[PDB]
Amino acid sequence: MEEGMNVLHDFGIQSTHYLQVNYQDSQDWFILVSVIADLRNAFYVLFPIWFHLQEAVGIKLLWVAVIGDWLNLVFKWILFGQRPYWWVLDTDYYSNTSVPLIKQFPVTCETGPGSPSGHAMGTAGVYYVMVTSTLSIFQGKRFRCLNVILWLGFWAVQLNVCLSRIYLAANFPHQVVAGVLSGIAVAETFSHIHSIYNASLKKYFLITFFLFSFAIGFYLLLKGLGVDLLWTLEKAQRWCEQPEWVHIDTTPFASLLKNLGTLFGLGLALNSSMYRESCKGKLSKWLPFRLSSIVASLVLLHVFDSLKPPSQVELVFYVLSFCKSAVVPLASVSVIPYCLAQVLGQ
Ligand SMILES: O=P(O)(O)OC[C@H]1O[C@](O)(CO)[C@@H](O)[C@@H]1O
Numbered sequence: 001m002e003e004g005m006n007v008l009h010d011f012g013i014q015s016t017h018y019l020q021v022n023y024q025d026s027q028d029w030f031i032l033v034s035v036i037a038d039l040r041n042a043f044y045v046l047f048p049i050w051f052h053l054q055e056a057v058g059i060k061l062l063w064v065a066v067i068g069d070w071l072n073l074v075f076k077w078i079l080f081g082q083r084p085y086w087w088v089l090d091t092d093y094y095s096n097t098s099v100p101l102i103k104q105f106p107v108t109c110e111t112g113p114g115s116p117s118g119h120a121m122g123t124a125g126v127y128y129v130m131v132t133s134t135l136s137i138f139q140g141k142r143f144r145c146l147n148v149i150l151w152l153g154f155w156a157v158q159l160n161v162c163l164s165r166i167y168l169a170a171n172f173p174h175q176v177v178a179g180v181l182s183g184i185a186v187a188e189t190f191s192h193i194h195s196i197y198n199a200s201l202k203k204y205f206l207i208t209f210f211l212f213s214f215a216i217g218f219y220l221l222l223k224g225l226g227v228d229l230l231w232t233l234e235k236a237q238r239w240c241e242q243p244e245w246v247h248i249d250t251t252p253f254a255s256l257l258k259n260l261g262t263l264f265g266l267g268l269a270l271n272s273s274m275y276r277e278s279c280k281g282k283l284s285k286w287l288p289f290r291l292s293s294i295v296a297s298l299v300l301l302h303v304f305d306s307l308k309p310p311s312q313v314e315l316v317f318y319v320l321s322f323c324k325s326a327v328v329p330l331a332s333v334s335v336i337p338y339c340l341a342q343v344l345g346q
Helices: 003-022 024-035 039-044 047-051 055-079 118-137 143-167 173-191 201-225 232-238 254-270 273-279 287-304 314-325 328-333 336-343
Strands: none
Touching: 003 024, 003 143, 003 173, 024 143, 039 047, 039 055, 039 118, 039 328, 047 055, 047 287, 047 328, 055 118, 055 173, 055 201, 055 254, 118 143, 118 173, 143 173, 201 254, 254 314, 254 328, 273 336, 287 328, 287 336, 328 336
16 A cells, blocks of 8 residues: 555656656646636536526536535545645655656645546536537437547547646646546436436425535544544645645635535525526527527626635635525526516517
8 A cells, every 4th residue: 555655656746747847838728727627617607508508408517516526525535645746845755866846836736635636527527418418419400420529529628637637736647537537427327317307495405404414424523533634734735835825715615515505506596486487578498588698697697706705714704605606506597587588578
């Protein structure tokens, strides 16, 4: 368990050093890839687009994203993985040998273990869902050429995300592969479970409560036993060079709370009374209606993302993050379409 992991870590460090030294004129592109792969874009830019066209795709997209993120946190907690930016400066493995230089970027101070890659998991799951849904829509309309093109695009996206994660020295190469495989598995599993559409608010509430209870109880039980699951928060602050790069939005509680909040918000929004009256005033099948809904949702959500909850106190930050992430599904399905109905169509 010792040598088998030390060899793998050394291989990862060597690969990161190679990528950083011999491909120096690509760093901005890799940063851009690592920025547009965050799940915030899957909850703010992709759900509004896919919900107004084949709503089932949007519902499946949100369910896959949320459950994949929760499984990612659980596996991160139970697997006890390292990261290749506090390892070279800490390990004793390089005694009697030169220390390979590694360059750190402002997007390379992550608080939390990285046994499965976080960006790769979500990207693989969401984009697999998107590609499969797009293929399923167009089957009725040289379809094999379309299959080839979309699968090539999806695999190119996955490979670019993997190289971006490795290049920044944020994760090891043996973690992005696991993330991609697990994301594909989760996407397939929720592809083959058609039992989440006709769901009442009670099921959504109970599911969110069960997930929250399991996470908190597991963490508290491990702490009571003696195991600390928040060891990485100490390491991230020390081995980060500039101390202003470590944030609080990339800690393994804000992500969980935001995922639970957006799940609860979607559940409340679907069962609301305003969603029932979508097909009133003006029929929802109109192409201009769908385009206007998409445009208004995107613009208002992008402007509303400018609000940042205060982080002086952690409990206030947590509650405000929950209440803020619970609104983004509630405003694109039940409020904006109602306003469009009441404004135009008469
Ligand atoms: O890909 P990494 O190294 O896990 O980065 C963390 C990512 O995973 C997450 O923890 C999501 O679970 C986010 O904080 C972030 O998007």
